[PDB]
Write an enzyme that holds these catalytic residues in place. Structure first.
Site, PDB file in Angstrom:
ATOM      1  N   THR B   1       0.858  -1.215   0.000  1.00  0.00           N
ATOM      2  CA  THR B   1       0.000   0.000   0.000  1.00  0.00           C
ATOM      3  C   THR B   1       0.878   1.244   0.000  1.00  0.00           C
ATOM      4  OG1 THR B   1      -1.549   1.318   1.312  1.00  0.00           O
ATOM      5  CG2 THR B   1      -0.236  -0.311   2.479  1.00  0.00           C
ATOM      6  N   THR B   2       0.554   2.178  -0.888  1.00  0.00           N
ATOM      7  CA  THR B   2       1.312   3.408  -1.018  1.00  0.00           C
ATOM      8  C   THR B   2       0.384   4.592  -1.233  1.00  0.00           C
ATOM      9  OG1 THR B   2       2.629   4.583  -2.721  1.00  0.00           O
ATOM     10  CG2 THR B   2       1.901   2.349  -3.231  1.00  0.00           C
ATOM     11  N   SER B 129       3.906   1.147   2.315  1.00  0.00           N
ATOM     12  CA  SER B 129       4.765   0.052   1.902  1.00  0.00           C
ATOM     13  C   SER B 129       5.712   0.398   0.752  1.00  0.00           C
ATOM     14  CB  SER B 129       3.869  -1.133   1.538  1.00  0.00           C
ATOM     15  OG  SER B 129       4.577  -2.148   0.878  1.00  0.00           O
ATOM     16  N   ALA B 168       3.094  -5.400  -2.098  1.00  0.00           N
ATOM     17  CA  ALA B 168       2.085  -4.984  -1.136  1.00  0.00           C
ATOM     18  C   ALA B 168       1.203  -3.858  -1.676  1.00  0.00           C
ATOM     19  CB  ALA B 168       2.733  -4.574   0.169  1.00  0.00           C
TER      20      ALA B 168
END
Lengths: 227, 203, 227, 227, 227, 227, 227, 203, 227
Positions: B1-2, B129, B168
């Site tokens: 996740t970003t 992430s 991720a």
């Protein structure tokens, strides 16, 4: 003006509520006790009414523990609850220290209980007086206590209705080291005179204990023997 | 996740991708991580969902109430601060989360907030992430002389990169640009994917 | 109008309840004390009634600890409970600091206790006054305390019924560094004059302590010697 | 109708209870203080009665800490307890911050304490007023406080019985930067005039402190020198 | 019948206690304020008596923080305590959010505090009204608050004794965006007319703040310039 | 005899205190609302006095959240505090459930709050009535609430001073699905007739919301258009 | 003398406050219910006034859960809050035990709630009576409850205004195992006679449940069919 | 143990198997993991039996109470958020469970909820020991253009597959379909086992 | 003067409130019980009114547990709540000790509960009396209890309205070890005479238990057999 509320000192330094309470005890039955030979005895006038009451069940002399008993006078309900308090309170000293060494202390605790309602605002005082008798580490001991929480040790005393009377008799004819048999006699005689404005002594309730052993409650016939 | 928030001239852009996973098991392809939190402000979530979500609701209602009571909107530094206090106040049993709050009051702003209530303002910053990857392209191509349109592209690029090097992260990348003129506006999915295609990017 | 409730300042700045309380103490027995040579002594008038009371058991001078005693006047019950408070309170200072260095402090605590009931709404004040006497780190010390929580240190003083009287005698014939024997005398003389409107002094209760050692309670014969 | 209970605003916007309280303070002894050269001094009229009182023990000027003292007027008991509160309260600021930087703050805390009983229903207000004097981080400071919790800083002032009187004298003959010797004089003169309807000033109690050092209590002879 | 107790709605829907409270504030000093050019100013009539009072120390306009001040009218004690509450309450918003963004909120909290005593039984309401003035995130703001907890924002207003009077003057001659110098003038003129039944305006206390910076308290001479 | 204390049922089964409270609300301003086309609108009579009041700042229709507003009548202070309660209470449902699904529930909570003071002894009831209006999951909704905690849903209603009047007009000329423009008209007409014994309607305060979107507050000119 | 305060037994053994409360319920609307064939039904007289009320919204028969409903009479506010209590209380038994096995128990809890205010000093009793109806593990059950906390199970009963009347009709013409259609009839007839001194029965509110399934609320037309 | 909620057109279908085990000791062959929680909503339990059951009861009631007081059924996202709040509020001494709540208000829904109050809606999702396997086949054959009947089969297939590769799952698989037309209706055991046989599946 | 408030001893030593309470119980129904052969029985007069009451549901003899039952007289509500207390209280002894060995103890607890309201200020006493009957570790036991908390063990007794009457009959014709059949007879006869000023005995409620087994409630016909 000053006699309607219990909180509160009167302009002359008196707790009217505690006084009114005392009244309730005067109207209580008569009982007394005294130290004698090597023990102490308690005797209460068991005045009965109906044939329908369960006789003995109306025990006025109550045990706190095998070596200490007490007799009370005043609002019956108040007396009962105050008795049980002393009972568990007694147990408490036993369980922590291992032994109820000084009886004086037992009475002091129950006294303080009563003293609290003497000042903590919203709550009616205990309308009762009672006397504790028994033999402790120090020996045979006799105490009395009033609704004010006042406590004193005696050589002999009484409480309830005919206090003034019986007390005066003793005040006069009390014999220091009177052996049990004679002591119970002097007592019963003293109890008689007092409340005996109404002739018949009826069936008194008597019990005693002597240093070295547990309390003994006199049986119907035994008491009738002195009667 | 970003997720990423970027400042430029008279606007603040904020975007995130949207994959929610449990280790390697990618369980949810379309989660939401970009939330408008007030007329002229948005927040990006990153970390443990449960914490993130409740935190968002708290922030939402708290902001609405304040607006009504004070008749004005809460300043960006102010909302950062509040969040800061809440988080730090419970540092020993924290909301394991990482928040990015951007908006525009008298000027544009973007604050990075950590689970220990540490709050710091930057001209841009990434969270999540894939943070390093995006920090790369940004450190390489961001320019404070860009236009809101150049901005939205940059952002799309950066996240797209992270998507390549970070398992991720993933899913449809979505952006919202907030300006005083139009307020907080989230760009339409088609327009986004259109820019992706135009840019020669993927997914 | 203003003298029925204790809460509450009167239009002239007075706590009527605390006043009414003071009344109760005046009606209390008479006792006094004074510093002398190298100690201090306490003396209370032990006025007895019935032959049936257990004599000494009605101890008016009570010990707080081997080096500090106090005597009280007012509602007996209130006095007792307030005494025990000082006793444990005394113990407390001993157990934390290792030593009851300043007696003044002991009285202050018990005083504050009493002061609390002076303002905390729903609760009747302590209808009692008392004096603490003993020798501390500073030396022989003498204090008195009233139901208001007011406390003062004296060279000699009295309390209870014949306060005004006995106090005036001392106020006049008090001799600074009077050696014990003469001090107890002056005292007993002073106590006499006062309450002695009724001639017979009866059997006074007297005890004393001198710097360097513990308290000494005078025995029946010893006191009768000055009587 | 409106002057029997303290709770409660009167139809004209007044707390009658707090007023009645003020009455109690007027009937208190008279004392005053004033800033002078480079310090401030306090002076109280020590009016004594019996030869039997322990002189100095009736200290009216009390220390809160080596650099701040206060003198009080009103219900003695209330004054004492309120003093001790300030004392520990003082200690508290010392232990947290390391130093009682602003004395004004000390008085504010004790004032708020008093203000609380001004509105919290079931409890009688503090029937006392007092003034704090000392030198702090800011310099010599003088404050006064009434039962209402109202607090003000002065250049010179008084309290107790002869307030109006003594205050007017100062109001007139107060000299700004009067050096200690002359300041104590002006003061004692002012105190005299006021309460001196009864001629004899008796033995006043006076103490002072000057920037740079601790408080100094004037000895019997020293005060008698200005007397 | 209905005007002796504060608890409680009257048959006509009114809290008499809160009314009686309002009375107390009318008898308070007079003060006012108004928004002007790009700030707001506060002005209070500093009516002094004795030469013996410490002048400025009787500050009526008090700071809550460098950007917000308030002036009060009514029971002085009540005003002080209510001020400090706002002060710490102010600090609280600063420490959590990092900035006191909306002043309106500050007043609301203190208002609610007052509103509580409006219904919670056993406790007398705050006999005071006050106005908060300052510049916040929204800009220069002016609020007033009464003992009922009622709060309103103004363009200009007054409070205390001569409210009705001064308010009417403004109601008439108030000029929207009057530049500071002229605004303070209009104000002082308005304050004059009102309380000036007694001619002399004495020494008014005035302070102001303007958007962009902190509050400025006018010095003796500066104010005397408009006087 | 029975109308002096709020605790307590009258011999005829009525809470006099709650009645007296109702009185206070009648003396409140007049306002009303009604459901229409696909929304609901609120309108209050903004009766102003001085030129010195800050116009709009005296907002009578207050927002609870972008989709629900309420207008109140009675003791202003009580209304404010009760409003804020609903506001945070609203927020609470939002933060736990994620959405204020049923507005009815919001009013019920605030109602219960008020109902509590209806029986919990020592505390005066909330002297206020108010109506909540908005569109929820169920659709446009209209509720009213009195000091007793009684709550009801309407098609149209009013509250405050001219309730009986305006309500009767509607009771008669209320048109079910009247489109906004005509609805606001009927309303303003109804509001007029009622309070308009005094001819001038002044400047009414009106706002409305329609299913599908947030609330809209009418601007000065827009309202003046229907006026 | 004895009818002004609710605390407290009257010289004849009655809680006047609880009586006064009962009065409030008599002035409540009329409703009744009865067991029939294999279920139980509830019916309340929905007496409406204005065209402006939102019809059905004034639901008198309320559901506690799909299998148990109740109808109330007395102070509306009190009824509502007491209803919700039963609702959550119902939920509670469901969540712990997994099933509301005995409805009798549900009513007992709510009854005890009411009984508490019957003796706990400072708080007004619940001015309401209500009846619970539904089918439980035991079968169809019918209970009623008064402000005293007294609860009883019936075969048929009523409450509110015309209790005595309607109850007598049933007392006479109640038919044991009357099938639903006939039961609702007998009921509506009984309800009519009673309150029908004013001829028009208006629109009654009726609902019923039968063993084996959930409650059924009769629709406007269906009820109008028996009307 | 394995459960699955699947969204389609105008319905939502939920099914679970029902073997309850203690490690390898399969102690109970017929547990219940599918529960109706409201007129238009169901829930699937998975994890520790203790926590799940109590959780179901609370929810069940909390919903009925809500219905009565608000006169309308609680929306699905609302039930999901409520739950989310409860669980996260006690994250440090969590109800070790994993819930799936499906239902239909204005449209069909299905939310995944974890022990930390993380809540996320998908078009379908599985829960439990055998999750992967079903996610395998669903990923392979699910289509939003299926009929409620096709759905019921896909699901059975999905569960029967997980039953093969996961010893923790087993026993009679049961399904319930909830539509706005008919509401929450659980399919007749026979009919289910019928489809199994037809499909050539097993157990 | 002395009979308006329950707090509080009267000048003659009586709790008027508790007396007034007793009144309430006299106006209660009549019931009695007695020990017999090898068990004990309870019998209450079930006086019914309307045909509309649910017969048996108005059970006066209630079970505390399979081996102990009690019957009550006085304020119905008070009786119910006091019953449930004994029930759970019973359960408590069972769960800790594993067995309710002495029933006397069960009654004592409930008695103490009642005794508490006898003195704890703000709360009305329990207006009820009741009797507990059952067989315990000691054997068949019979107790009665009044609002004062007074408790006594009987051989036979009654309570409620016709106490004095029925009790006298027993007082006279009570037969020690009367076998059940004859005992129930003597009882019913005794109950008759008493309340039977109104001829018809109606349908009495009777139950009994015998050592060795659980309680048995007599069925309609069985009781009608002795009737």
């Amino acid at each position: 003006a000053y006699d309607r509320a219990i909180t509160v000192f009167s302009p002359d330094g008196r707790l009217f509520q505690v006084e009114y309470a005392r009244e309730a005890v005067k109207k209580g039955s008569t009982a007394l006790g005294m130290k004698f030979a090597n023990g102490v005895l308690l005797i209460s006038d068991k005045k009965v009414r109906s044939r329908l009451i369960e006789q003995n069940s109306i025990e006025k002399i109550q045990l706190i523990d095998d070596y200490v008993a007490a007799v009370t006078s005043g609002l019956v309900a108040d007396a009962r609850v105050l008795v049980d308090f002393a009972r568990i309170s007694a147990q408490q000293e036993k369980v922590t220290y291992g032994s109820l060494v000084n009886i004086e202390n037992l009475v002091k605790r129950v006294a303080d209980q009563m003293q609290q309602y003497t000042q903590y605002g919203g709550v009616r005082p205990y309308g009762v007086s009672l006397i504790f008798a028994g033999i402790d580490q120090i020996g045979p001991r006799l105490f009395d206590c009033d609704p004010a929480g006042t406590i004193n040790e005696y050589k002999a005393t009484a409480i309830g209705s005919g206090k003034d009377a019986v007390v005066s008799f003793l005040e006069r004819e009390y014999k220091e080291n009177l052996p049990e048999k004679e002591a119970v006699t002097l007592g019963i005689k003293a109890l008689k005179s007092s409340l005996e404005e109404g002739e018949e002594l009826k069936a008194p309730e008597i019990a005693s204990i002597t240093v070295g052993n547990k309390y003994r409650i006199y049986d119907q016939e035994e008491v009738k023997k002195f009667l | 996740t970003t997720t990423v928030g970027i400042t430029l001239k008279d606007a603040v852009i904020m975007a995130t991708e949207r994959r929610v996973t449990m280790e390697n098991f990618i369980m949810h392809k379309n989660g939401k991580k970009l939330f408008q939190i007030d007329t002229y402000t948005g927040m990006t979530i990153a970390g443990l969902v449960g914490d993130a979500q409740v935190l968002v609701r708290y922030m939402k209602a708290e902001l609405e109430l304040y607006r009504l009571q004070r008749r004005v909107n809460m300043p960006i530094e102010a909302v950062a601060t509040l969040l800061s206090n809440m988080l730090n106040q419970v540092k020993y049993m924290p909301y394991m989360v990482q928040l990015l709050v951007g908006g525009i009051d008298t000027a544009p702003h973007v604050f990075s907030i950590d689970a220990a209530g540490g709050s710091v303002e930057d001209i841009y910053a990434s969270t999540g992430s894939g943070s390093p990857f995006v920090y790369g392209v940004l450190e390489s191509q961001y320019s404070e002389k860009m236009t809101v349109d150049e901005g939205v592209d940059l952002v799309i690029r950066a996240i797209s990169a992270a998507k390549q090097r970070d398992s991720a992260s993933g899913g449809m990348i979505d952006v919202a640009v907030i300006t005083r003129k139009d307020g907080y506006v989230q760009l339409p999915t088609d327009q986004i994917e259109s820019r992706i295609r135009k840019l020669g990017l993927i997914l």
